[PDB]
Design a protein around this ligand. Structure first.
Ligand SMILES: [Cl-]
Ligand SMILES: [Fe+3]
Ligand SMILES: [Fe+3]
Ligand SMILES: [Fe+3]
Ligand SMILES: [Fe+3]
Ligand SMILES: [Mg+2]
Ligand SMILES: [Mg+2]
Ligand SMILES: [Mg+2]
Ligand SMILES: [Mg+2]
Ligand SMILES: [Mg+2]
Ligand SMILES: [Mg+2]
Ligand SMILES: [Mg+2]
Ligand SMILES: [Mg+2]
Ligand SMILES: [Mg+2]
Lengths: 82, 301, 490, 304, 490, 83
């Protein structure tokens, strides 16, 4: 159930390939993306990591799964705070 | 990955280099990926062009890159050699002009030159265009390099012809020299065999057919049926310049024959290529025969 | 006596004729010639401004090579490999890999014009162009060959274009688009006017000066010599553009210039931007990459375009903004993913260097500096795991370079995507997506390296599998920090 | 002693120049042997070579305030001479190769090989005399700019000698029974048509005054060779279907014309002193009759 | 086709003939020809071993200059003058002054043979020799000219032979004796066999290596290029000696070789000896001057002489002793009288250097070391008056170099004097006196610079008056300590 | 009354021209020579200095003058310490 996304993490300089799973929650998706950004090129922060379609203003629910999100493989997401 | 020491030459040469090998060998990355010669859509127009006219050529070898110019010329040594030849031609032109050579040719020879010599600039430019085509399509950089130098040599001959056309016109201003050559190329019967031959040859787009028709049929015919007869007629008409100029051009032409024959030898390592090369020679030879016969009738008229 | 060139030159390009045994279109098919339906006779007005002749050519070029090779031989005891700054050695490695076999590819762009251009003067100048680019390809193989015995990364002077290394794919995608993959008139416009006249001429002047500063006179001399060839063939585009404009093809001409300048810029930003602002020792930086773009590239484009009757490309303000930002992100990426490069990137973010960056790019520290702060503290704590990547960057389906933006306090990153014939494409700028849509058949079924990764072509499906796919043959070939992280000591 | 700034060029040029030509830098004012009139060379003032130079250079009737100011009108230096002559030799060596390939020599008119054996191949002696004589003017001339023209002229003489050796051998391959390469010394020594030339050169080679040597060699002997040997040989060759020899001679005549050119420039320089008109004219009148007799004898032989 | 040189070469030197209209002796006067009464027919046996032809010559020499000049141009902005060790700069200054216009003088030695040698092969090879030395003179004027604007001492590249500076007089007295002031066969023997084959070949090879070590690749390339010409004309002497021996003139051949080798040695010891053992940085000394003389000059002479059927010169044991001693005293003199040189001598007597000198010349510190001890103490006490002379050294009436000996514990100095035709002459060795007596008419009325001083030719009669006479034109031109005495406080 | 001699001083490395006076005693000649050697290239030493014709064994008397000695101009002398 591998599910590739292209993810841009808040305050990082690029978009990266992150392969997540169809049944991952958004919380779990954010954690998998953060692994490749936080304490590498982005300072660690308190606050809730949220996922959204790239450049959109609406956030996915934290416990919504990739499978029910309406996202398609290889679409671009942002991982942001608050 | 493991640790490896530096190699003394390129990795592709290291398990076996001359200056020639170092700077000439295996540079066409466009042969690496059969379905995508170029780093573009596999169906881009130029990728389709190359897949048809290079990759799919009925002339086949598993290692075209292994071809080697028998003269192993590189840009540096080509210019060393040709600077020497142009020094020769420059002194020829300068000193023959000083002694008013063109005044001393037999009566009427200027009209033979206007008709049979000055329009060669069109033939030579066709050779130039054609050699450039074989350059860009050939499946090995060592083959392409021979074609580059041959393209340059063709421009060399064109330039010689332009210079002498103008110069001769200074002594013979009423012969149409430098004025009538396009019309002759287009309409004079003696040129129509050559023009038909080159128009058709320039639209043979398979790299192998292009090579065989240009270098194994057209160019040897020009040596035997144009260059050499022109020398003989010149001597008979007290033109001592033209045969000496052609001598230097024939040096280029023999070099073209030398690498061409070497490529045929390479190709014939695949026994299937004999029939393919022979088939193209048999196809093109009749046009070349007629080109020669029409030209020689005009020269003897 | 000899007669002056001006008296016989016209006969050297009196070579057009009216075909009868084949048609004009068979002889010059539009897909290879690019004549846009403009008939033969109109092309005879084509007039190259800088004329030359075969005897002159072989004479001057013999002299040029005599000097270039004599200097190389006389300085072979100078031991540049051992005595140069690592920054300079990496500059050589990057340059030779990105350029040498590309120069040889340019022979084919010139040959395309020599055969298929309807303009006689173009066909002759392109013949000299074939020879010039032959020279440049051979020089830039012969010279780095000397260093093979010192360092396997110099093998990439030959190997890069034979590889699937990501920067090599970006170079090949660009050069196959503007040099080898289009009709003759497109090559004249995109290669000789936009790329050579527009970028490489001034770049090579800059690089030769840099080489002298680095104490590498063999390379300074080599690059200076190559630059003196440029105008002889780079001149071909101008008259082609004039001809198009005079014959109703202004918008077609503009489009080709627009496409080529942007594509050149993105590659230039990844290859040369980091060298100028980061690899070059601070004391030897006469100006920033931005100042260079403004001083030597942008203004020249503006005035050469106006002279032709063309306009600044539609994206000019985007271009100007990009010069402030793009190469800083590209540099960060090349360094963080240094293991995928065939040279050793210099981080270039010592405190004194960051002071210079702040001066040249006000606000640099609040942007890229935020990332380098994290990286720098990790280096100081010897957290090598945190300065080594474990995934791939997302890559532009046009430039083949990763998707970047501005980091830190002004975080802004934008991907420009496109659904086209059932497939989702991603682009690193509005202009790159536009280029795609200008000629989708050139691009639409191309797979970038991440597309191939996702499609199963790269095994194992890991960064390690990707390094193998990219053509690395030993541990030593993969890029490392140019200074072994000594920069973090102070 | 005071403090002075560096000079941008040699002190002897630094007044009137900032950056002289390459020619000036490497050619001008190099004969230190003219600095001391009592001791040209740094030896006893009465050493044999000092006596020789005081007599045959310093005391020449040909006088000038500033011989060093003489300038080769071509401003040739070693580097630019070799560039030029490598080109000319590429021309000639290519002609030799091509004419040999088409067996040019077998097609000359009947008897021409005997005229060549009699009138062409012994030119190696005449040309070597010119070589020897040019070297003498070199070593005696009172300015390095004059001597340099002489060096290059010595080399050109050897060039002509070498052409003649090459062609003598080559022609003998086609015509083995004409005495080519075998009888030239005897012809030079005993054949009437050569004796004018031999007498001329034996006497010219023993004119040791640098001025008389220059005038006899370059204003009398060498122009006579152009008019009465080279050009008539050229015309006769064409008449006999020898196409190579006239082309070869035209390359050699290019050298000869260059020699005439610098010689004329030296005369113009010399004539700045009006006393030199009578001196030069007198030497030309002294030597011309020998040269005319040489020409007449050679031409009778050529035409026989 | 072309015919190989062996097929036609003999005709190029078939140029001897029996004169009739003048006598053989009129055509080839003994004073200019040096034929020693040997008739023309015998000279036809002369056979130069290394054949050359005109077309080959202009082609090869064209290539050599293409390289030499292109290297100079490409290194123009490398700032060699500013970045070289002072010892190297002084080495250049000394070399160019002593050599450049002397090379041009060698044209005349070659011209003497070209006209007056009775051997046809000699006359032709001497013609190439005229050309070779023209090249060398022009090269070695063109190359130092660049430095005139930086340093007045480089003016002496041109000025030295035009001056009465003492070392210039020593050079001219030698070169006028062996090059320009004797008959053709003497030139063949004394210049091409004794001096060129015997000394300059190995000297130039050594100097080119020293240049590379010093980082001066332009000069290294230049000197190497010049050395490649030497064999072409230096070959002339051997065949001349063989012919003399074959024709009953062995005694005369030996005498001329004996003379030439000794005269070359004394000048070599003052010009090159100090450079090798004192100017060259200690770390870059591969052998001592003595070791160089032994293993590259003396042994080679011994073997070449035996090969020709000649003997070691009578003074060989004196020669061997001299290489231990002479140049140490010559160096001391050049340094103490440095204000009279056009270069800046390096003292070369730091403790580390004195240790090396002691290793290479056991007993050095007991001898020359004693003098340097006094000099060093005075420098430390800033007694500049005591390290600058007031008087003139006494000068050899042959070599024109001052009369020296061994100082210190083992003090020994010997002047060899002669009363001749009412005048008292002084010589620096038994051999120098012998040379004078071999040919007194060559030498007897020559006045050395001290003779001139005592004859009232130099006013004021002081060392300062002498400096004016020697041609110095400013304070800057006079020799100073190369390192401004930095070596003393070490 | 100037009189040129060429003088070699004990333990020095060379011979120098020294212009002395006809009426100088040998002691005065030795001092004039010593001036150009001692504390320049030769360590100062206690002792009487003597003059002799070059390489001679016999010394000139100390109070004999140049004129009295029969020395000719430009002859070579040694200056050496007393035995
Ligand atoms: Cl000082
Ligand atoms: Fe290029
Ligand atoms: Fe280019
Ligand atoms: Fe020399
Ligand atoms: Fe020499
Ligand atoms: Mg779960
Ligand atoms: Mg397909
Ligand atoms: Mg093979
Ligand atoms: Mg016309
Ligand atoms: Mg038929
Ligand atoms: Mg570690
Ligand atoms: Mg004077
Ligand atoms: Mg004048
Ligand atoms: Mg003092």
């Amino acid at each position: 159930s591998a599910f590739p996304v292209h993810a841009a993490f808040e305050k990082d300089f690029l978009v990266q390939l992150v392969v997540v799973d169809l049944n991952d929650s958004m919380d779990q998706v954010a954690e998998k993306v953060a692994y490749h950004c936080v304490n590498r090129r982005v300072a660690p922060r308190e606050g809730v990591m949220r996922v959204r379609k790239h450049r959109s203003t609406e956030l996915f629910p934290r416990d919504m799964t990739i499978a029910e999100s309406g996202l398609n493989p290889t679409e671009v997401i942002d991982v942001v705070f608050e | 990955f493991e640790s490896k020491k530096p190699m003394r030459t390129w990795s592709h040469l290291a398990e076996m280099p001359s200056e020639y090998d170092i700077v000439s060998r295996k540079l066409h990355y466009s042969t690496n990926n059969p379905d995508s010669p170029w780093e573009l859509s596999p169906d881009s127009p130029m990728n389709l062009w190359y897949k048809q006219y290079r990759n799919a050529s009925p002339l086949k070898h598993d290692n075209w890159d292994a071809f080697t110019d028998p003269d192993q010329l590189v840009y540096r040594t080509y210019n060393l050699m040709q600077d020497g030849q142009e020094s020769y031609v420059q002194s020829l032109f300068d000193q023959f002009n000083e002694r008013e050579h063109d005044q001393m040719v037999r009566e009427g020879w200027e009209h033979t030159m206007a008709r049979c010599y000055s329009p060669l600039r069109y033939l030579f430019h066709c050779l130039q265009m054609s050699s450039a085509y074989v350059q860009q399509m050939a499946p090995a950089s060592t083959i392409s390099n021979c074609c580059i130098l041959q393209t340059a040599d063709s421009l060399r001959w064109l330039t010689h012809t332009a210079y002498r056309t103008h110069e001769l016109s200074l002594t013979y201003p009423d012969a149409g020299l430098g004025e009538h050559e396009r019309e002759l190329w287009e309409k004079e019967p003696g040129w129509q065999g050559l023009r038909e031959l080159m128009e058709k040859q320039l639209t043979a787009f398979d790299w192998g057919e292009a090579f065989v028709s240009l270098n194994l049929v057209v160019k040897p015919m020009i040596v035997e049926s144009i260059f050499k007869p022109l020398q003989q007629q010149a001597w008979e008409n007290n033109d001592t310049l033209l045969p000496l100029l052609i001598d230097s051009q024939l040096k280029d032409a023999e070099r073209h024959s030398r690498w061409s024959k070497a490529l045929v030898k390479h190709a014939l390592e695949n026994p299937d290529n004999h029939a393919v090369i022979e088939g193209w020679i048999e196809k093109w030879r009749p046009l070349a025969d007629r080109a020669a016969e029409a030209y020689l009738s005009m020269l003897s008229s | 006596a000899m007669h002056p060139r001006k008296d016989w030159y016209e006969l050297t390009r009196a070579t057009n004729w009216t075909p009868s045994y084949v048609t004009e279109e068979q002889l010059f098919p539009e897909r290879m010639s690019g004549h846009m339906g403009i008939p033969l006779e109109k092309w005879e007005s084509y007039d190259e401004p800088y004329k030359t002749s075969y005897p002159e050519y072989v004479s001057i070029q013999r002299e040029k090579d005599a000097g270039a090779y004599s200097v190389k031989a006389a300085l072979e005891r100078a031991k540049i490999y051992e005595n140069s700054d690592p920054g300079w050695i990496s500059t050589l490695k990057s340059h030779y890999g990105a350029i040498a076999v590309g120069e040889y590819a340019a022979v084919t762009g010139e040959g395309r014009m020599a055969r298929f251009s309807k303009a006689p003067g173009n066909r002759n100048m392109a013949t000299f162009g074939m020879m010039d680019e032959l020279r440049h390809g051979q020089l830039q193989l012969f010279f780095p060959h000397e260093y093979c015995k010192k360092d396997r990364q110099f093998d990439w002077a030959w190997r890069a274009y034979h590889s699937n290394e990501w920067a090599a794919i970006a170079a090949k995608h660009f050069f196959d688009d503007i040099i080898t993959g289009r009709d003759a008139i497109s090559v004249a416009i995109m290669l000789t006017f936009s790329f050579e006249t527009g970028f490489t001429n001034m770049q090579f002047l800059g690089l030769a000066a840099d080489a002298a500063e680095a104490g590498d006179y063999t390379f300074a001399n080599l690059i200076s010599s190559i630059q003196t060839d440029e105008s002889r063939h780079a001149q071909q585009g101008g008259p082609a553009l004039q001809l198009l404009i005079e014959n109703g093809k202004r918008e077609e001409a503009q489009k080709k210039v627009d496409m080529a300048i942007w594509r050149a810029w993105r590659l230039f930003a990844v290859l040369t931007g980091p060298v100028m602002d980061y690899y070059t020792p601070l004391e030897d930086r006469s100006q920033s990459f931005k100042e260079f773009m403004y001083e030597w590239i942008i203004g020249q484009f503006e005035r050469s375009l106006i002279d032709l009757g063309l306009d600044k490309p539609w994206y000019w303000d985007l271009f100007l903004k990009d010069i402030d930002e793009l190469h800083h992100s590209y540099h960060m990426g090349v360094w963080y993913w240094r293991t995928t490069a065939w040279w050793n990137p210099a981080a270039g973010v010592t405190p004194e260097e960051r002071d210079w960056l702040e001066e040249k790019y006000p606000g640099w520290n609040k942007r890229w500096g935020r990332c380098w702060d994290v990286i720098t503290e990790n280096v100081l704590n010897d957290r090598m795991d945190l300065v080594s990547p474990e995934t791939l960057p997302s890559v532009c389906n046009m430039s083949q370079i990763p998707l970047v933006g501005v980091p830190g306090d002004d975080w802004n990153i934008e991907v420009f995507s496109l659904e086209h014939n059932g497939r989702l494409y991603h682009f690193g700028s509005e202009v790159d997506r536009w280029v795609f849509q200008q000629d989708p058949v050139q691009y639409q079924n191309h797979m970038n390296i991440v597309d191939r990764f996702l499609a199963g072509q790269i095994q194992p499906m890991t960064l390690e599998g990707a390094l193998k796919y990219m053509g690395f043959q030993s541990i030593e070939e993969m890029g490392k920090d140019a200074h072994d992280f000594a920069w973090a000591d102070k």
